Structures are given as C-alpha cells and as structure tokens.
Amino acid sequence: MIKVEIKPSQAQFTTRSGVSRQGKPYSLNEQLCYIDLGNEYPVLVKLTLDEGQPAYAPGLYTVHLSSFKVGQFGSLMIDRLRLVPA
Amino acid sequence: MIKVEIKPSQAQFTTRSGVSRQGKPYSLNEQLCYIDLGNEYPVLVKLTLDEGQPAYAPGLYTVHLSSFKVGQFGSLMIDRLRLVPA
Numbered sequence: 001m002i003k004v005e006i007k008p009s010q011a012q013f014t015t016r017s018g019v020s021r022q023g024k025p026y027s028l029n030e031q032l033c034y035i036d037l038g039n040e041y042p043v044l045v046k047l048t049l050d051e052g053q054p055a056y057a058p059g060l061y062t063v064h065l066s067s068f069k070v071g072q073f074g075s076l077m078i079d080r081l082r083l084v085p086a
Numbered sequence: 087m088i089k090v091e092i093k094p095s096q097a098q099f100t101t102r103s104g105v106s107r108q109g110k111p112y113s114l115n116e117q118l119c120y121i122d123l124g125n126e127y128p129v130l131v132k133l134t135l136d137e138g139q140p141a142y143a144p145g146l147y148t149v150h151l152s153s154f155k156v157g158q159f160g161s162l163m164i165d166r167l168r169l170v171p172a
Contacts, residue, residue, distance in 0.1 A: 001087060002151070002154070035154075035162065036151075037151060037154060037155075037156075038151050038152070043156055044156075044160075045156055045160065045161065045162050046159070046160040046161050047161075048161070065088070065122075065123060065124050066124070068088070068121075068123060069123075070123075070129055070130075070131055073132070074130075074131065074132040075131065075132050075133075075134070075164075075167070076121065076131050076164055076167050077163075077164055078161075078162055078163055078164055081161070081162050
C-alpha cells in the first residue's frame with residue numbers, strides 16, 4: 001500500500017479554468033499531498049480532484065483501485081490518483 | 087493492494103530490439119499478466135521487465151513501491167510496473 005498524507009497546510013484546493021476545443025467551459029480542482037516513495041523523506045505530489053468532490057481533509061490515506069486504467073499501449077497507467085482513508 | 091496474477095500461459099517473455107537515437111543497441115523483454123481492476127473479470131496488461139531480470143513465475147503478486155515516480159507535470163505516474171510475491 002501507498003501511504004499518502006494530506007498535511008494541515010494542504011487542506012485546501014485551487015481551481016484552474018478554461019475552454020475546450022469545441023467551446024465547452026471546464027474547471028479543475030487541484031490539491032497537494034505527500035507520498036512516501038521510500039526515499040529519505042516523502043515527496044510532494046499534485047492531485048486533480050473529481051467533479052463535485054471536496055478537498056480531502058488532513059490525515060492518512062491509501063490509493064483506491066479506480067486510480068488505474070490500461071493505457072493505449074497496453075501497460076498500466078494512473079488515470080487520476082483517487083484516495084480512501086487509511 | 088493491487089492483485090496481479092501471472093497465469094501458467096504467461097510464464098515466458100518476448101524480446102523487442104532496436105537502436106537508440108545516437109547509435110546504442112537496446113533490448114526490451116515484455117511479459118503479459120492479469121490485473122484485477124474491480125470489473126467483472128481481470129484485464130490483460132503488458133509488463134516490461136528490468137535489465138537482467140527473468141520472467142516472473144506463475145502465481146500471485148502485488149506491486150512494489152518502486153513502480154511509481156513523480157512525472158514532469160508534478161502528478162504521480164507509473165514508471166514500470168515492478169512486482170513482488172503476495
């Protein structure tokens with residue numbers, strides 16, 4: 001299991017916006033977190049939240065299976081990192 | 087944890103080859119597996135093995151932390167899916 005931590009300083013999201021190729025508006029909410037990848041300290045990672053989801057609260061989390069998909073070359077890829085409470 | 091299974095029919099690898107941009111030869115070993123992504127059946131996924139590693143034997147496996155890296159846009163990505171026995 002991947003250990004992900006939202007620190008107290010990471011409790012908010014920011015929003016970026018724009019317009020798609022054929023005219024539709026979009027908004028993307030982004031939040032930061034720390035992920036332990038086995039180095040001396042955890043590393044900073046950007047999360048893009050799904051539509052209508054609040055920011056994750058501070059605490060410990062692991063990664064949900066729905067984060068992954070098979071990509072166009074047949075290998076596993078991350079679609080969007082989706083989290084669940086540890 | 088991600089459940090990965092190497093079936094008896096997937097016990098071998100194949101090798102692709104070529105030449106890099108500035109003249110160096112390369113060889114890549116590829117093996118197939120099944121990964122349970124929570125749909126009605128597991129899906130077929132291609133693995134690229136690391137240099138000097140044999141094919142994984144049939145059995146059950148989970149994913150090692152070294153499979154992941156932070157990508158050039160700051161989000162988590164899979165580098166190469168690396169496996170360990172379950």
